[PDB]
Every structure is written in structure tokens, then in C-alpha cells.
Design a binder for this molecule. Structure first.
Ligand code: M1J
Length: 847
């Protein structure tokens, strides 16, 4: 049909590749994913039309609210008698005159009540037919949340800024919601446990090799047996035809058992050449058998062993690569993995205060710590009691002998009834260590029960990353994330961008491609907007490309203006939403304000006019830095962890104002960076006005009177935070231009080159002089840094988990758990609270 064709062209433009290539993929699991994945879209759409227009508006404009409505102590103290002042605006008449009505109401009031008292104040000079909007952006207070719980409101309370809201008619916004229609695509309409034996695979011959074959059977990151090398053979004729046998009985193969193979070379000095992984069981629970042609992959940078089991699974798309032919045993009938029922029949067929405390002490340990064999057998012999302390489940999982059908089954049964655990702990079971399907299933259930959309968005990038660790295209995690993204555009955005940014990586081109297809096919009119965005970025990447090649600094600016002035460019880079925050409208380019940043890598400084009716109450211009050339993933993770830390200190009662500015990777070493209005570098303050005593003076001039004190406070608190943080994360070398301060005293860092590889933030005499060595102010400062350090050491588990999940991404500074152990060093996990305290005190003495 017509709608089908158009939708296909647009989806092709958004994903980057045309849909018609997915069709030509003669692969059962691919087609069955593209089809079977559709009832998730159905569920989401049904949820969208369930309450009709209100449900739609909620789908497009979800409430940006904190996780818990409760407010910390100091935050509540910011309120005058537990109340808040709020300015509600109204546009009226043909001239759209703006009239303001100020109010003082309880911070726990519902937006409906705010509208009530607002109309009351408007008449003293009509029921709930109105909704509240944020003056200057596209945020709406559509749900009956307490106003203070909205991120915008709580922020306004902490910063001391007064909220400016706009009263809008419900029908004026509903009239803006398009009538979407999800059209179904045109592409929608045995022995088991008996096999007794040992695993043996035959390698036949290799092609495209102009050395031996090392192989192994692994369960995630652990080999279910010993690796076996095939007979060394001359490189000219790649013909082994050999039969390798493994010390693993066929029934004893876990559900997620994988074959990991590679081709090593011989000078003595061994070096891999091409790697590949195969699922012993397919997506229909069948067991591999017969011949199979597997196209291998080149080796990633920084490889330790002659095997890459953590690498993606499947046959290389580029068939013009080393292709290995394998031969699996074929038995009487098509063998399947037993049903959970038979697992229960074989499962059923197959204690002192001292150790009662020992188990607790074990569960208290962090994930990085290793578990000894005696401790593994210990936890296993105590597998039933470990159910009362559910947070020990990960370590318990690590104690199972996954090469024994018995233990595997009994563990399955222990999972079918295991108590749910908190999300932060549930994600721990979603990294590469836990590849089992029922384990990841349990974790996904936990996330479905206790994960707030706030926390989901906060932990989105990691989840999208652990997608790569899934054994099959169609799984529970992908369906959960996809439904959440098809019911919450605030999540669907960074879902689509986290996915698209890696469409250049052929390791996951297929997966993320199909997923992105199913998403774009059911996301609604927003697809259009995304396309516009994808075009804008497109154009940008072109220009920067021509800037870093043909005209690779004043001439660069001239050329840039001329290319930018072309109408194609003007249209394609005007009137679209900010990929950093889709609530931000970006209208006409203010070219007179755009420029090349003249620092390194030719950063592009872009300035747009804010088209919002009330753009003046937020910012009349939105400035962003398009950078093409520098990998932004590391910066994304760093800023994320900074926001999380800030939320921890706030939820703990110490106001250390951090600044986790935006930062979104949208492709291969391309991305956007949020501009912090009114900020300058240390070196810039030192310049205007070798010298190290004019920072305090500059701040004093920029903050005269009763403001002075306030300013100081900020610069202190923030500073302390950015100190502690930078010490724990081991951020790269800081200097006078890596650091920045705002005209109000806010201090924050930028450009986190490399982390986890030592006191980087050696507070210079500037900062110290700004805080007051022997002064009560410095004492309060030290107390702050100590408190913060403790607060973070109390979530070392969370952070370590986050990194362990981010391993899947090919970031250089994060290639193995060895890189993560650094945090285990700086946090003093193996020591006690006091021991770690002395550790941080002494570490901070080393000026
Ligand atoms: C715009 C400001 C204020 O808002 C916060 C962001 N800021 C900022 N970020 C960066 C940056 C950080 N991280 C990266 N991975 C890459 C970059 C890239 F832009 F180079 N660089 C700069 N430079 C501009 C002034 O001259 C020298 C420094 N400024």
C-alpha cells in the first residue's frame, strides 16, 4: 500500500539503511524477530489509545518528576514555612499579551490545585480544563504529581530560581496531538534429556586465509571445560578435518553454552587472527547439528588471550572474510533443551549463627572481590538459606557448577521463586558474567517491578549496552526496553539515539537495526521529528568533514559560513528538536553567533533562537557544540556518574552542587555538547585582569554585596564535590582550562579525556584563597569532602556495576575488569569505614 511504502522510506532514512535489506536476510531468527516483536508494539499502542487523548499527551509529554516525592531536609528548609512561590503566566488576546500572576502555595500541591488558586488570583481583579506548561520549553505537568516532585520544580527550589509556568488550554495542546495509526507491516501475514554422550566438534576446512584453530566451550565468561587446540596445519592449505572432544557430557551443557573459536599463528609466539562465537542452542531451543559456515571477525584492540568469548555472537555479515566450516554431531531426532517441567522433575529427583553471619558478610562484599572455591562450595551447600538474604544472589550464581545438569536445574528452581531485589542490584545480574536466560529473566522482572522511568532514563545507556550480551534477538530485556520506549518518548528518544549511534558497528548492526526498525514502526509521528534531526546531524557531519579535510583558521570560518548559508543547509538545520533534550525547540540559526571553536578538532559552536512563546523566561538562545572527531562515550559515562553522585549527595543531605551538562554520542566519534551559559575557564579569568590571586578578586567584582558570601559557598561546595569525584574516578590531568567557573561561583570540569588512569585535582592556591589553610572555612570544606567520600563508598557497588555493564562498549580506557579495579582501590572496599577515612585524609594531604 501507500502508507506502507512511505513508512518504509522514512524508516530507512531514520535508521540509515533501507528496510528492504532486512527482508533479503534469509535467516529464521531475523524474520521471527521482526514478526514476533510486533505484539510489543501492539501492547504499547493499545496503552497509548487506552485513555485516548490524555493517554496520548502523556505518551508525548511524560512528567519529568523525581523518583520519590519526599524532599531532603535542606531542600525543604529552602522553603519558607514549607511553601513555594510560583509565577503562573497567561497569554491573552490577538496580541498574545503575557500577564503574570504570582502565588504562594504548598509545594505538595497538585497541578490541578495550582490551576485553581491561579484562576482565583486571576478573577479577584471554569473547572479543570487547563494544563500547566514550563515557560520556555515543551514540558507539561499532566499528571497529579505534587509540584515539588517535578524535576523542574525541585531544581527551582534548590537553585533559588522562581518557577515560571504557563497556563494552557487542554484543547489547545490536544489539538496539537496528531491522530496516529499503527499499521501492521506487510511482513507479518524431538529428543531432549535422553541424549547421553560427550561433546565433540569437527573442524573441516577454512577459506579466505592467504597456524591452528583454538576452541573452547564457555558459559558466558567462564569455560565449561578445558580448551582444545586442533592439529597445527600449513597456512597454504587450510584443511584440518579434525575431531576435537571436550570433557563435558552433552546433557550437562547449560542453556547459554557457547562455542568460542579462533585461528592462532606460530612463528613460540602465538597470536590470534580471526575469532568467532556460536550458540550451541539456537533461538528455538534446538541444539546445533551438522555442518555450519561461520564467517570470522578481526580482533579488537587490547586483547589478552587467544580467544574473545565476550565478543558478539553470529556469523560475520561481510561474507568476504575468513569462513570456517564446522561439523556438529547429529543424533536420532532434533534435540531440544528440556522444558522447565522436566527441569523440575530432575531437580526434585536430584546452619549455625557463625556461618549464618558469614553468609551476610559475604553478600555485603562488592562485586569486584573474588570468591574462593571454599566459599563457592560453602554458598552452594547453603543455597537454601541464601534466600532470606536475596542480595547475595549474584555471588550465589557465581558458585554454581554450570557444567552439571543437576545443579543448573536446582538453581533454576531456586530462581523461579526467588524474592525480588532492588534495581541497582538487579542490573548486576545483566552483565556478561550472567548469560543464563532465567537469571536475566529474573533480573528483568525485578526491573519491571521496581524501576521508575526516572531511574530508567538515568540508567538507559547501560541497559542498551547489555543488549549486546543477550544470546538471541528476541529476549525479555529487549521487549521490556522496547515497550517502555514505545510508551515514553522521553525514553524512546535516547533509546533511538543510543541505538543509532552504534549502527556503524557491524558487530551489532543487525541487532540494533532490527530493533530500531520495530521502534520506528510504532513510535508514531515522532519518527518525522527524528528524521529531521538525523538530517541536521547529517548536514553537520558533512560540513565538519569538509572542514577537517579540504580546508583543514579565518579561511575555515569563511568557507564554513558560505557552506552554511546554502539553502539546503539552512532548511535542514533549522526548526527541529535538540537531540540533547527533545523538549528544546531549535528554530532559526543565528549565524552571526556561530563559529569554529579554535581549540582542537575544529569544534562547531552553534546558536539557535528559542521559538518558544516564553523563550525569554528560560533562554532566548540555545547554544550547542557539535564535535566531530572526539569519542564522546567516555564523557557521556562521566557526566552520567556525576549526575548520579549529585543525586546521592542531595538524597543524603549535603548540597554539593554538581553540573552534569548534556552530552550525547550520535555516531562514530560525533556528538553534541551542552553549552553552560555564563561560564569561563580558570586560565581565562587569570588572563583578563604568571599570577594566582585574581580569581577571588574577579568573583568578588562579579559578586558584590550580600551576594559575595553566597558565591563563596557555591564555589566551595561544588569544588569539594568535583575534587572528591575526580579523585574517585581518576579523571585525566586537570589544568587551568579543564576547569571552569560561572559568574555566580559554580565550579565544574569539562572534557574528561581518560579516567581510571593519583590525585588529579591538586587544588591550586587559587581555590584555597577562594575558600577563605588554617581557617574554619577550610575545616567545613574538609568535612564536606569526607562526607562525600563516605557517601560514594556506600554505593561503590552501584558504580562498579555501572562500569562492568559499560564493558560491552569498545571504549579504550575500559577494556577489562582490571581497568575497573582502580575504583576498588580509591574507595578502599577491602578496608573498613575508618581505614578508608584515614586513606582519603592522607591521600588529600599529598598536595
Ligand atoms: C561550552 C563549555 C561550557 O559549557 C560546558 C561545555 N564547555 C566546553 N566543553 C568542551 C569539551 C568538553 N568535552 C569534550 N569531550 C569535548 C569538548 C569540545 F568542545 F572541545 N570544550 C570547551 N572549550 C571551549 C572554550 O575553549 C576551550 C574549551 N568547552
Amino acid at each position: 500500500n501507500r502508507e506502507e511504502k512511505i513508512l518504509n522510506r522514512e524508516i530507512g532514512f531514520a535508521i540509515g539503511m533501507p528496510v528492504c535489506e532486512f527482508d533479503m536476510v534469509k535467516d529464521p531468527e531475523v524474520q521471527d524477530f521482526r514478526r514476533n516483536i510486533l505484539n510489543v508494539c501492539k501492547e504499547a499502542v493499545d496503552l497509548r489509545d487506552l485513555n485516548s487523548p490524555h493517554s496520548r499527551a502523556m505518551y508525548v509529554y511524560p512528567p519529568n518528576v523525581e523518583s520519590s516525592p519526599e524532599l531532603p531536609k535542606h531542600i525543604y528548609n529552602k522553603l519558607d514555612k514549607g511553601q513555594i512561590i510560583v509565577v503562573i503566566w497567561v497569554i491573552v488576546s490577538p496580541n498574545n499579551d503575557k500577564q503574570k500572576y504570582t502565588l504562594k502555595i504548598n509545594h505538595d500541591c497538585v497541578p490541578e490545585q495550582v490551576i485553581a488558586e491561579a484562576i482565583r488570583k486571576k478573577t479577584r481583579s471554569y473547572q479543570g480544563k487547563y494544563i500547566l506548561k514550563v515557560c520556555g520549553c515543551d514540558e507539561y505537568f499532566l499528571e497529579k504529581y505534587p509540584l515539588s516532585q517535578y524535576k523542574y520544580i525541585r531544581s527551582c527550589i534548590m537553585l533559588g530560581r522562581m518557577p515560571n509556568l504557563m497556563l494552557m488550554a487542554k484543547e489547545s495542546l490536544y489539538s496539537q496531538l496528531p491522530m496516529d495509526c499503527f499499521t501492521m507491516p506487510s511482513y507479518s501475514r524431538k529428543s531432549l534429556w535422553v541424549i547421553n554422550s560427550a561433546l565433540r566438534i569437527k573442524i573441516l576446512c577454512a577459506t579466505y586465509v592467504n597456524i591452528y584453530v583454538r576452541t573452547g566451550i564457555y558459559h558466558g565468561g567462564e569455560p565449561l571445560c578445558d580448551n582444545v587446540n586442533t592439529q597445527r596445519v600449513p597456512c597454504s592449505n587450510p584443511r584440518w578435518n579434525e575431531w576435537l572432544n571436550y570433557d563435558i557430557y552433552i546433557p550437562d551443557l547449560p542453556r547459554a553454552a557457547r562455542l568460542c573459536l579462533s585461528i592462532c599463528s606460530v612463528k613460540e609466539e602465538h597470536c590470534p587472527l580471526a575469532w568467532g562465537n556460536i550458540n550451541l542452542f539456537d533461538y528455538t531451543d534446538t541444539l546445533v547439528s551438522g555442518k555450519m559456515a561461520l564467517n570470522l571477525w578481526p580482533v579488537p584492540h587490547g586483547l589478552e588471550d587467544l580467544l574473545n568469548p565476550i565478543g558478539v555472537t553470529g556469523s560475520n555479515p561481510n561474507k568476504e572474510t575468513p569462513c570456517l566450516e564446522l561439523e556438529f554431531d547429529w543424533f536420532s531426532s532434533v534435540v531440544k533443551f528440556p522444558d522447565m517441567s522436566v527441569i523440575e522433575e530432575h531437580a526434585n529427583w536430584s546452619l549455625r549463627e557463625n556461618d549464618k553471619e558469614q553468609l551476610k558478610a559475604i553478600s555485603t562484599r562488592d562485586p569486584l572481590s573474588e570468591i574462593t572455591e571454599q566459599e563457592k562450595d560453602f554458598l552452594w551447600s547453603h543455597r537454601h538459606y541464601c534466600v532470606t538474604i536475596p542480595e547475595i544472589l549474584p555471588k550465589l550464581l557465581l558458585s554454581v557448577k554450570w557444567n552439571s545438569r543437576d545443579e543448573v536445574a536446582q538453581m533454576y528452581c531456586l530462581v523461579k521463586d526467588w524474592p525480588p531485589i532492588k534495581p541497582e542490584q538487579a542490573m548486576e545480574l545483566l552483565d556478561c558474567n550472567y548469560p543464563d536466560p532465567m537469571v536475566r529473566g529474573f533480573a528483568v522482572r525485578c526491573l519491571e517491578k521496581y524501576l521508575t522511568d526516572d531511574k530508567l532514563s538515568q540508567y538507559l545507556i547501560q541497559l542498551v549496552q547489555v543488549l549486546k550480551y543477550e544470546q538471541y534477538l528476541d529476549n525479555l530485556l529487549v521487549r521490556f526496553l522496547l515497550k517502555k520506549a514505545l510508551t515514553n518518548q522521553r525514553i524512546g528518544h535516547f533509546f533511538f539515539w543510543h541505538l543509532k549511534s552504534e549502527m556503524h558497528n557491524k558487530t551489532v548492526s543487525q541487532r540494533f537495526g532490527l530493533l530500531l526498525e520495530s521502534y520506528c514502526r510504532a513510535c508514531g509521528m515522532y519518527l518525522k521529528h527524528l528524521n529531521r534531526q538525523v538530517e541536521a546531524m547529517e548536514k553537520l557531519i558533512n560540513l565538519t568533514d569538509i572542514l577537517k579535510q579540504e580546508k583543514k583558521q579565518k579561511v575555515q570560518m569563511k568557507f564554513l559560513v558560505e557552506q552554511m548559508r546554502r539553502p539546503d543547509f539552512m532548511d535542514a538545520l533549522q526548526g527541529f528538536l535538540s537531540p540533547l533534550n527533545p523538549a528544546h525547540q531549535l528554530g532559526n540559526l543565528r549565524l552571526e553567533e556561530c563559529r569554529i571553536m579554535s581549540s582542537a578538532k575544529r569544534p562547531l559552536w552553534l546558536n539557535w533562537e528559542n521559538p518558544d512563546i516564553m523563550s525569554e523566561l528560560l533562554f532566548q538562545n540555545n547554544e550547542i557544540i557539535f564535535k566531530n572527531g572526539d569519542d564522546l562515550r567516555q564523557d557521556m559515562l562521566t557526566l552520567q556518574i556525576i549526575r548520579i553522585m549529585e543525586n546521592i549527595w542531595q538524597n543524603q543531605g549535603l548540597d554539593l552542587r554538581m553540573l552534569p551538562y548534556g552530552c550525547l554520542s550520535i555516531g562514530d566519534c560525533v556528538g553534541l555538547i551542552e553549552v553552560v551559559r555564563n561560564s569561563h575557564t580558570i586560565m581565562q579569568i587569570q588572563c583578563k585582569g604568571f599570577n594566582s590571586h585574581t580569581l577571588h578578586q574577579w568573583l568578588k567584582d562579579k559578586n558584590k554585596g550580600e551576594i559575595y558570601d553566597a558565591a563563596i559557598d557555591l564555589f566551595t561546595r561544588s569544588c569539594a564535590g568535583y575534587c572528591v569525584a575526580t579523585f574517585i574516578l581518576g579523571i585525566g590531568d586537570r589544568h587551568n582550562s579543564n576547569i571552569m567557573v560561572k559568574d555566580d561561583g559554580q565550579l565544574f570540569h569539562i572534557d574528561f579525556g581518560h579516567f581510571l588512569d593519583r590525585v588529579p585535582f591538586v587544588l591550586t592556591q587559587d581555590f584555597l584563597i577562594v575558600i577563605s589553610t588554617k581557617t574554619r572555612e577550610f575545616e567545613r570544606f574538609q568535612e564536606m569532602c569526607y562526607k562525600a567520600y563516605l557517601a560514594i563508598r556506600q554505593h561503590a557497588n552501584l558504580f562498579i556495576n555501572l562500569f562492568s555493564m559499560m564493558l560491552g562498549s569498545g571504549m579504550p580506557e575500559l577494556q577489562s575488569f582490571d581497568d575497573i579495579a582502580y575504583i576498588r582501590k580509591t574507595l578502599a572496599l577491602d578496608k573498613t569505614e575508618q581505614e578508608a577515612l584515614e586513606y582519603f585524609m592522607k591521600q588529600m594531604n599529598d598536595a
